Design a protein around this ligand. Structure first.
Ligand SMILES: *[C@@](O)(C(=O)NCc1ccc(I)cc1)[C@H](C)NC(=O)[C@H](CC(=O)n1cccc1)NC(=O)[C@@H](NC(=O)CC(C)(C)C)C(C)(C)C
Ligand SMILES: *[C@@](O)(C(=O)NCc1ccc(I)cc1)[C@H](C)NC(=O)[C@H](CC(=O)n1cccc1)NC(=O)[C@@H](NC(=O)CC(C)(C)C)C(C)(C)C
Lengths: 230, 230
C-alpha cells in the first residue's frame, strides 16, 4: 500500500528540446539559437504544460525550467499527475520490458522505467518559426515515443539533480540557471484507453528506435546511466 | 448507441503460422511440412484459444481453422471477447493512426484498424519440435506485434471469406478445407492496463516494421487491399 504510494510519487523529466548543431528533416523544425533566446526573453511567467503527445486532455505536469545552453535548448519538467502516475503504476506492472529492470547499479523504478520506454522523447510545441521573423511563443512540451527534432531524448528520474547530471553537455553554470528556475489539482483529463490508443500511433513512426539511439549517443546518455530503454 | 455495438461485433483474423519456404532465425522455430501434417492429424478437437501475445489471462477468442497449405500453415481465428473488443473500441477512438482511416475503397473500421496496427503478427505456441522426434502439439495461437516466424502477417476483417480472400496463395480447395472447419462466456481475464503494459514490450522489438513489410510482400497482401497498417 505504501510501495504503490512510493511509485506514484512525482517523476522528473529533462532533455534537449533542440540541439542547435542539428539540421532538421523538415524546414518548419528550424529553431535557431538567436530565435530561442529572443522568444525565451519575450515570455518565464506561468509554467508551460507537459502533456502526452500534445494532447490537451493528457496534461500530466508542467515544465519547471527552460534554458538555452551552448548545444541547444534544455528543459526540466515534472510529472505531478496522480491519475496519470497511477495509470503508469498499474500498466508498468504488466510490462515484461519493465520486469527485466534497469542496468545493475540502478534500482528498479517501475513507473520511471515505464515512462522511459513509452515516452522516450520530448517534443516542443511553439510558434511557427518561418524565414524572415523571430508574448508567448513557447506553448507546451509533449512527452512522446520520439521527437521530430533529433537529440531530444527524454531522461526520467525521481530527482531533478539526478536527471540533470545525466547529460554530459550541461555545465555547472547551466544547471545553476535551471535550478534557479525550479527554485487546481490533477490536470489529466484522459485515461488508460486514451493512452492505449496513443500506443498504436507511436508503433508506426518509421525508424523510431534508430532515432533514439542516435539521440542517446548524440546527447551522451550512452556514456552515463539511467533508465533509458532506447 | 448501436454503432458501438456495430463495432463490438466479432473480428476474424487469418494468416500463415509458418511458411515452409522460410529458413528460421532461431533453430527452435523449425516447423517442417511433414511435422505439421503429422501433428494436425494427431490433434481438430477442442478449439485452441486465441490470446494477446501468449498471456493466458488475455484470451480474446479461439482458432476456428488450421490447414497445411502448399506454402505453409494457415489459420483462421475469431476474436469474440466482448471485454477486449470494448477496450479496443474505446482505445481506437484515441488513435490518430486509426483516425486517418484505411485505403480508399475500404470502409473505416476502428476496432479492425486498431487490431491491424497493434496486433500485426500471428504467433503459434507449440511443442518443442527439435531434430530427432516429430495427443496435442498445438497449444494456442497468439496475436502480437510481430512474429518470430516470417510471413505470419495478421489480416483482420469482419468476414472470414474476405480475410481469406486477401491471400493470393490460397486456392479454392484451400478456402474449402478451412471453411469446412468453421462450418463459459468471455474468456478475457485482463484489461486496458494489462494491454497498455504489453504495448511497450512491442515497442522495443528491433526491426519490427521492416519484418512486417517483408511479411506483407511474401504472403501477398501487398498486391490486394486490407486494413494492414504495416
Ligand atoms: C514533436 O517532436 C512531436 O510532436 N513529435 C511526435 C512525432 C514523432 C514522429 C512523427 I513521423 C510525428 C510526430 C514535434 C517536434 N513537435 C511538433 O511537431 C509540434 C506539434 C504541435 O505543436 N502540435 C500542437 C497540437 C498538435 C501538434 N509542432 C509545432 O510546434 C509547430 N508549431 C505550430 O504548428 C504552431 C502551434 C500550432 C504550436 C501554435 C512548429 C514545428 C512549426 C513550430
Ligand atoms: C511468436 O511469433 C511470438 O511469440 N511472437 C512475439 C515476439 C516478437 C518479437 C520477439 I524478439 C519475441 C517474440 C513465436 C513464433 N512463438 C513463440 O515464441 C512461442 C511462445 C510460447 O510458446 N509461449 C508459451 C508461453 C509463453 C510463450 N514458443 C513456442 O511455441 C516454443 N514452444 C515451447 O516453448 C513449448 C511450450 C512452452 C509451448 C510447451 C517453440 C518455439 C520451441 C516451438
Amino acid at each position: 500500500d505504501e510501495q504503490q504510494s512510493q511509485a506514484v510519487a512525482p517523476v522528473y523529466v529533462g532533455g534537449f528540446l533542440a540541439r542547435y548543431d542539428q539540421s532538421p528533416d523538415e524546414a518548419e523544425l528550424l529553431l535557431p539559437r538567436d530565435v530561442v533566446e529572443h522568444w525565451l526573453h519575450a515570455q518565464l511567467s506561468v509554467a508551460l504544460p507537459l502533456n502526452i503527445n500534445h494532447d490537451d486532455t493528457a496534461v500530466v505536469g508542467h515544465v519547471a525550467a527552460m534554458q538555452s545552453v551552448r548545444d541547444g535548448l534544455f528543459c526540466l519538467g515534472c510529472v505531478t499527475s496522480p491519475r496519470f502516475l497511477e495509470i503508469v503504476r498499474r500498466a508498468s506492472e504488466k510490462s515484461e520490458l519493465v520486469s527485466r529492470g534497469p542496468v545493475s547499479p540502478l534500482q528498479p523504478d517501475k513507473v520511471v522505467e515505464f515512462l522511459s520506454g513509452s515516452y522516450a522523447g520530448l517534443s516542443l510545441s511553439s510558434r511557427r518559426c518561418d524565414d524572415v521573423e523571430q508574448t508567448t511563443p513557447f506553448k507546451h512540451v509533449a512527452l512522446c515515443s520520439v521527437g521530430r527534432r533529433r537529440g531530444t531524448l527524454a531522461v526520467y528520474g525521481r530527482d531533478p539533480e539526478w536527471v540533470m547530471q545525466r547529460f554530459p553537455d550541461l555545465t555547472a553554470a547551466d544547471r545553476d540557471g535551471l535550478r534557479a528556475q525550479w527554485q487546481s489539482g490533477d490536470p489529466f483529463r484522459s485515461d488508460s484507453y486514451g493512452l492505449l490508443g496513443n500506443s498504436v500511433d507511436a508503433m508506426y513512426i518509421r525508424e523510431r528506435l534508430p532515432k533514439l539511439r542516435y539521440d542517446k549517443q548524440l546527447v551522451g546518455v550512452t556514456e552515463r546511466e539511467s533508465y533509458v530503454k532506447a
